Model the fold of this input.
Amino acid sequence: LERDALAERYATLSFDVQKIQRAHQAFSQFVGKHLSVAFDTDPEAEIRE
Amino acid sequence: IQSLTARAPVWLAAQDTLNQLCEQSGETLASSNDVTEYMQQLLEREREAT
Done:
């Protein structure tokens, strides 16, 4: 019974670790595909003008 | 021409430092997409190192 809560907390921590890892990997892939145009001006407004 | 002239040194400087930065890295960078790929490789290496 005691170890039940320990395992629950460990599972929560492991899931948090996995989520952070996946977020970091997504950010890495992003920057790989993404930085070239990040934060640049909006074309649509210019095209409409 | 004026526009190009205005952009003339800026491109060259862009290359110049780029070359040094390209030389600062063992791998040679040839495309902006390749630049991003090298960047993210560096990020992954940094994450593993830490």
Observations:
- The helical segments of chain A are 2-34, 43-48.
- The first helix of chain A runs from residue 2 to 34.
- DSSP finds two helices and no strands in chain A.
- Chain A touches chain B through nine residues (CB under 8 Å).
